[PDB]
Design an enzyme around this catalytic site. Structure first.
Site, PDB file in Angstrom:
ATOM      1  N   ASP B  19       2.247 -11.021 -48.136  1.00 41.24           N
ATOM      2  CA  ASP B  19       2.448 -10.156 -47.208  1.00 41.24           C
ATOM      3  C   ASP B  19       4.138 -10.260 -46.757  1.00 41.24           C
ATOM      4  O   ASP B  19       4.624  -9.299 -46.450  1.00 41.24           O
ATOM      5  CB  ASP B  19       1.700  -9.998 -45.820  1.00 41.24           C
ATOM      6  CG  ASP B  19       1.421  -8.900 -45.325  1.00 41.24           C
ATOM      7  OD1 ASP B  19       2.234  -7.989 -45.287  1.00 41.24           O
ATOM      8  OD2 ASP B  19       0.275  -8.813 -44.400  1.00 41.24           O
ATOM      9  N   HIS B  22       6.961  -8.293 -48.162  1.00 41.28           N
ATOM     10  CA  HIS B  22       7.509  -7.000 -47.341  1.00 41.28           C
ATOM     11  C   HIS B  22       8.728  -7.408 -46.562  1.00 41.28           C
ATOM     12  O   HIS B  22       9.609  -6.532 -46.443  1.00 41.28           O
ATOM     13  CB  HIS B  22       6.488  -6.431 -46.569  1.00 41.28           C
ATOM     14  CG  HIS B  22       5.354  -5.917 -47.335  1.00 41.28           C
ATOM     15  ND1 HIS B  22       3.879  -6.134 -47.186  1.00 41.28           N
ATOM     16  CD2 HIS B  22       5.097  -4.820 -48.365  1.00 41.28           C
ATOM     17  CE1 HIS B  22       3.058  -5.412 -47.977  1.00 41.28           C
ATOM     18  NE2 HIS B  22       3.838  -4.822 -48.707  1.00 41.28           N
ATOM     19  N   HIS B 201      -7.357 -10.854 -40.506  1.00 43.30           N
ATOM     20  CA  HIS B 201      -5.686 -10.477 -41.243  1.00 43.30           C
ATOM     21  C   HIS B 201      -5.150  -9.759 -40.030  1.00 43.30           C
ATOM     22  O   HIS B 201      -5.149  -8.533 -39.943  1.00 43.30           O
ATOM     23  CB  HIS B 201      -5.755  -9.839 -42.347  1.00 43.30           C
ATOM     24  CG  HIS B 201      -4.503  -9.743 -43.014  1.00 43.30           C
ATOM     25  ND1 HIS B 201      -4.103 -10.211 -43.986  1.00 43.30           N
ATOM     26  CD2 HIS B 201      -3.702  -8.690 -42.582  1.00 43.30           C
ATOM     27  CE1 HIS B 201      -2.705  -9.926 -44.191  1.00 43.30           C
ATOM     28  NE2 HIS B 201      -2.564  -8.805 -43.585  1.00 43.30           N
ATOM     29  N   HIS B 203      -1.836  -8.392 -37.695  1.00 43.63           N
ATOM     30  CA  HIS B 203      -0.670  -8.243 -37.736  1.00 43.63           C
ATOM     31  C   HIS B 203       0.015  -8.229 -36.254  1.00 43.63           C
ATOM     32  O   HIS B 203      -0.819  -8.143 -35.423  1.00 43.63           O
ATOM     33  CB  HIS B 203      -0.042  -6.834 -38.405  1.00 43.63           C
ATOM     34  CG  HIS B 203      -0.051  -6.942 -39.855  1.00 43.63           C
ATOM     35  ND1 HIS B 203       1.169  -7.403 -40.540  1.00 43.63           N
ATOM     36  CD2 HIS B 203      -0.886  -7.070 -41.050  1.00 43.63           C
ATOM     37  CE1 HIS B 203       1.030  -7.539 -41.629  1.00 43.63           C
ATOM     38  NE2 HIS B 203      -0.211  -7.371 -42.064  1.00 43.63           N
ATOM     39  N   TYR B 292       0.418   1.806 -41.104  1.00 48.13           N
ATOM     40  CA  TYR B 292       0.491   0.668 -42.034  1.00 48.13           C
ATOM     41  C   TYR B 292       1.983  -0.166 -42.099  1.00 48.13           C
ATOM     42  O   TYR B 292       2.873   0.584 -42.088  1.00 48.13           O
ATOM     43  CB  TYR B 292       0.187   1.208 -43.523  1.00 48.13           C
ATOM     44  CG  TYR B 292      -0.257   0.103 -44.566  1.00 48.13           C
ATOM     45  CD1 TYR B 292      -1.563  -0.067 -44.557  1.00 48.13           C
ATOM     46  CD2 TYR B 292       0.695  -0.375 -45.433  1.00 48.13           C
ATOM     47  CE1 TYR B 292      -1.915  -1.225 -45.556  1.00 48.13           C
ATOM     48  CE2 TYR B 292       0.291  -1.394 -46.312  1.00 48.13           C
ATOM     49  CZ  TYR B 292      -0.959  -1.734 -46.292  1.00 48.13           C
ATOM     50  OH  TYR B 292      -1.542  -2.787 -47.237  1.00 48.13           O
TER      51      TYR B 292
HETATM   52  O1  LIG Z   1      -1.468  -7.410 -45.972  1.00 47.58           O
HETATM   53  C1  LIG Z   1      -2.381  -6.448 -46.284  1.00 47.58           C
HETATM   54  O2  LIG Z   1      -2.859  -6.451 -47.273  1.00 47.58           O
HETATM   55  C2  LIG Z   1      -2.572  -5.467 -45.137  1.00 47.58           C
HETATM   56  O3  LIG Z   1      -2.259  -5.506 -43.956  1.00 47.58           O
HETATM   57  O4  LIG Z   1      -3.163  -4.194 -45.481  1.00 47.58           O
HETATM   58 ZN   LIG Z   2      -1.052  -7.289 -44.139  1.00 45.26          ZN
END
Ligand SMILES: O=C([O-])C(=O)[O-]
Ligand SMILES: [Zn+2]
Ligand SMILES: O=C([O-])C(=O)[O-]
Ligand SMILES: [Zn+2]
Lengths: 317, 340, 339, 311
Positions: B19, B22, B201, B203, B292
């Site tokens: 991650d 990114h 997971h 964010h 996303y």
């Molecule tokens: O990190 C990933 O794969 C998401 O947040 O979808």
């Molecule tokens: Zn992610």
């Protein structure tokens, strides 16, 4: 040009679900060179067979064996297969043994991949023709239009298809979509390297299929010629897919030293990135607007059969 | 204080080198991987995730090309760790079973097969193939905010059916608060086999990365995804060193070295940050609009290019209900907005 | 979430008080007018203005203010049309005389802040603020250091004195949502039902928005936050982020989400010098329960005496130092440099 | 040849912490003072019980009951360890009888005297006020520095353990910072003055800490300041044994490019002097952590003794 003159090639449609039925309806609504001689299915209860017998097309719920016994088989010169890859292997064996041409809408890939606006002529006599993928039918025309003006070192396509409309077979074998499409992006699109990506989106207000095409070409490509090649390609696809259109103008982006991109096949590279944003709306007459992924398959298969029919005599040996 | 079992081991999965790709436009060098994997490994983490931002064969015009291939990155990490498992990430439609085989040959033993949170059924072949390789097979249900607790659990069950040993609630948009997280784990626990593990997971787009990972543990979660400084898409993942430091104040069995995670965060990872991994107007948009998180830097690149607000691009992307992997729509939205 | 979506959340900004710590108390008068105007037009109920350590915080100990509180409060009072101007007073630092000055420059809300075991020193300030007609709030600093029942009895004292609202104050940004909930439970148990409660979170564990929302779920009426979190340590609950999160929960915050987002990014963040974020040194404030205003002074000491501010802050936590003891930051630095 | 008992009989008013500690301290350390009587308001007070144990006449009828006592006719000094509103009452009654008054409240009727700084100036003062704990510990250092170079600004931080914080300080905590600043000016010699107070409930109780900030011109002789301060420390441990530097005296050049908004002055440049004190209690009756209260009884005691030896 008498009232009774029938010069249409009788075709057989194997598969009575969505693809077969939309293909049936599309032939009757549009083709001047083809008639539907038989719809071959597997279940007497299929709505496709019900619709066919309603439109007066001979039907069988007994597979291709059922077809071979029909009085209608005598004049079947082309069979569409919209069933399964394994079934088409068997279907094709039977049909070739009777000299019947096969247009295969499954992943069996027995015969050459054909994108009609790109490489039909090369395969005019092919006894078995594969129709690749919905993405390949959507995007390889664009890859080829670019390749005509300037070599495409790398082509990459992003198919975005509504969840509702995505085929059961695509769901079951999503890898195969990306592999078959990128394979055909090389063989038929002409790119030196090929990438296909597929996204299924479940938005309410189902989404019209989108396809984005990326071509990496040299920095000295003719921008105006690519634009014109692509816009003209779009006009050609529209002859058999009316809802196929550019959503955006052809886009160009310079990739210049100091911003090299690690383009596979090449290494780090400078050049020109062509982006072509397509929207592909289905005819909406049997399959809905958002089923462009199915509609382009039947559109493409109809037009291959039509071009077969426009060559000359159908001899079933 | 809480109802978390302070004795239950928290499985700690770091996503700094996946991650976090990114945050660095997938330009992590083989040397970043080796140094960061070794630091993470020596601090006691259970897994280190290595792949392009968008998973195996994420590298593309669509998401950004990667400075190295998955094979070289995974190999570099596999080689530099001595106890942690090398994890990786696979998105059907992008990566394939053949890409999974390659990553396995390169040293990955965990694979998280990620689909949109309504499309679990496209993951059978990947989940099934991974079980046959004897990989720890995990199912990722992305954009978990767009699903209802009950529906999400129904998708999780499908993935368990195919062979998933663990399922993660994925706040890909960073859009969910602590109550949303809890309702989803409850729904997961009702339907999952008791032996199927469960993971978080989060964010950080609303600054709930750490809070959401803790509340997940109160609700039965076994695995927590996090990364150093939060290095990741958007405002980042759960900040690993913060999460561990809060868990440590709670007496939770995380099995990590707080200070080593804290120092690797400051001394190795943050220096590599270009666009700051933080909550600001553009990353906030991701969580506010449910978008996303990997969209962030492409949105900001379109914004600079066509002279638009990155915030507006992201909000409009939410209104259109784009989901993971749809970066091509960012330009599509920007082109439409510039027509004004 | 059992939060009552209709109940109005009193939104109390501290960008221009707690945020003083982030900018070494060097807000200009034009900074104060501009920021109070943006926050005023975004719908907040109160804007808090004073030196970071409160009325007469300006000192060698905490830092000298670039203008006096009088000039600051007058600038804010003049710039706002609907919000009240709040101010902060720490007994032992500021006095009722200083209060009288602040009220006369426009403040109508005062938060009297003591350490959480020392509420009984605040009587003369709470009473005098009541006499002035002000909204009188009690602040129990460093609330992580005190049991819920202990913290509630101290809230009861400030209530006896006439305070109309007690704040749980996580001065060290050290508490999690469960710590927060336990403490609001304890307060609503003993406080008169009419007495309001508030939350003053710090972001040192990244829990500033989370703790504020949870306070709401356990009966809290008022929420302190600041633009970008501009505040001591890793900052306060970031106001634009908490409002965005409250919007998505449908809560009655009565603020303009975009206006706060834009003021936070376009006006406040460019004023930051040391980044108001969670990192090694500000994490240390929360991990070890150290007063958040120590952060910049501890980093001053860390540099000047060649030591780790992190270690400096852990040692300050180990000696149980509390708010206003900036001078011990140097004491601790001097001791470490010896050995 | 040994001493002759020339002891002055003194009266202690207040039966709590302060008055008892001053009682024990005089009986164990004075050659010059005898506790002649103790004055309370409650015949149950243990302080009164103590004094009777140690042979000290008591009354629980306040200062009124004191003047009627047969011991009062020899009382030459009285300490007030009660309150400022009571001291306003007591001062007049004792003044009219010739009794010198040492006030340990902040009533401030008499002048502020930090013994080691300005006692001699107030040797004849009939009422003497001992300011505050912080004043008794910080003004010495302020005046030490101001000796070398004039102190433009002086600031003191009093860190005191919550257990030892007296109820007077708790009930009027503003008065602490106000009394001390005033005396930082008058007795300490600073142009501007500031006093801050912090109560900390840390267990085990903290010893008192006092930080003193002095701001002088960039010229000031650093070595001379260090000498004046350390010498003044010893002058203070003559009656506050626990009074010690915790850190070597610190100095910071306030250079151009780091101007500070010193109040009274503008944005300024110069030298910053920081001296870190610690005041352990003597242990006589109050605990060691009660340095705030011990520095008061010690300083009142030494003022009484200086009166005694003055003649
Ligand atoms: O990190 C990933 O794969 C998401 O947040 O979808
Ligand atoms: Zn992610
Ligand atoms: O009063 C404050 O702002 C604190 O102590 O956090
Ligand atoms: Zn604060």
């Amino acid at each position: 040009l008498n009232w009774m003159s029938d010069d249409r090639l009788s075709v057989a449609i194997i598969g009575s679900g969505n693809i077969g039925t939309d293909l049936m309806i599309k032939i009757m609504r549009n083709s001047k060179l083809l008639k539907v001689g038989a719809m071959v299915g597997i279940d007497p209860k299929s709505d496709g067979l019900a619709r066919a017998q309603r439109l007066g097309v001979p039907t069988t719920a007994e597979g291709v064996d059922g077809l071979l016994d029909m009085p209608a088989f005598r004049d079947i010169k082309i069979a569409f297969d919209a069933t399964s890859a394994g079934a088409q292997a068997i279907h094709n064996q039977k049909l070739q043994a009777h000299g019947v041409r096969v247009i295969d809408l499954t992943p069996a890939a027995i015969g050459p991949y054909v994108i009609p606006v790109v490489n039909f002529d090369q395969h005019v006599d092919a006894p078995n023709i594969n129709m690749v993928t919905c993405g390949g039918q959507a995007t390889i025309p664009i890859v080829h239009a670019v390749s005509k003006v300037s070599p495409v070192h790398y082509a990459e396509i992003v198919a975005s298809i509504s969840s509702k409309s995505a085929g059961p077979g695509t769901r079951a074998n999503i890898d195969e979509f990306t592999e078959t499409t990128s394979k055909a992006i090389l063989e038929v699109g002409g790119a030196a390297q090929g990438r296909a990506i597929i996204i299924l989106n479940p938005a309410e207000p189902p989404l019209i299929m989108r396809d984005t095409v990326y071509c990496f070409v040299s920095a000295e490509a003719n921008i105006d010629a690519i634009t014109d090649s692509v816009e003209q390609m779009v006009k050609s696809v529209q002859e058999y897919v009316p809802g196929y259109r550019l959503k955006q103008k052809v886009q160009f982006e310079k990739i210049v030293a100091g911003n090299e991109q690690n383009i596979p096949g090449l290494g780090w590279s400078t050049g020109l990135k062509v982006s072509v944003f397509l929207e592909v709306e289905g005819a909406g007459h049997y399959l809905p607007s958002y089923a462009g992924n199915l509609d382009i398959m039947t559109s493409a298969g109809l037009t291959v059969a039509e071009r077969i029919a426009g060559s000359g005599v159908q001899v079933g040996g | 204080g809480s109802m978390i079992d302070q004795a239950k081991k928290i499985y700690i999965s770091d996503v700094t080198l996946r991650d976090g790709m990114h945050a660095i436009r997938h330009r992590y060098t083989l040397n970043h991987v080796s140094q960061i994997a070794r630091a993470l490994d020596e601090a006691g983490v259970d897994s280190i995730e290595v792949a392009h931002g968008d998973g195996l064969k994420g590298s593309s015009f669509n998401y950004g090309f990667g400075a190295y291939s998955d094979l070289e990155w995974i190999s570099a990490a596999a080689e530099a760790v001595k106890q942690a498992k090398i994890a990786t990430l696979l998105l059907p439609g992008i990566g394939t079973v053949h890409d999974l085989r390659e990553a396995y040959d390169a040293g990955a033993r965990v694979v998280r097969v990620a689909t949109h949170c309504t499309e679990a059924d496209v993951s059978r072949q990947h989940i099934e193939y991974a079980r046959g390789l004897g990989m720890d097979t995990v199912g990722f249900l992305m954009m978990s905010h767009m699903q209802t607790p009950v529906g999400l659990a129904q998708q999780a069950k499908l993935m368990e059916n195919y062979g998933a040993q663990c399922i993660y609630v994925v706040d890909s948009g960073g859009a969910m608060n602590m109550w949303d997280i809890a309702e989803r784990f409850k729904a997961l626990k009702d339907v999952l086999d008791p032996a199927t593990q469960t993971g978080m997971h989060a964010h950080h787009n609303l600054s709930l990365g750490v809070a959401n990972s803790l509340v997940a543990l109160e609700n039965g979660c076994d695995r927590v995804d996090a990364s150093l400084t939060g290095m990741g898409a958007g405002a980042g993942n759960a900040p690993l060193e913060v999460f561990i430091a809060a868990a440590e104040r709670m007496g939770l069995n995380h099995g990590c070295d707080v200070k080593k995670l804290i120092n690797a965060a400051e001394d190795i990872v943050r220096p590599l940050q270009e666009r700051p991994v933080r909550v600001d107007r553009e990353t906030l948009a991701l969580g506010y609009a449910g978008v996303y998180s990997s969209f962030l830097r492409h949105a900001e690149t379109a914004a600079k290019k066509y002279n638009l607000s990155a915030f507006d691009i992201l909000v409009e992307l939410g209104k259109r209900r784009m989901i993971g992997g749809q970066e091509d729509m960012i330009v599509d939205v920007a082109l439409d907005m510039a027509k004004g």
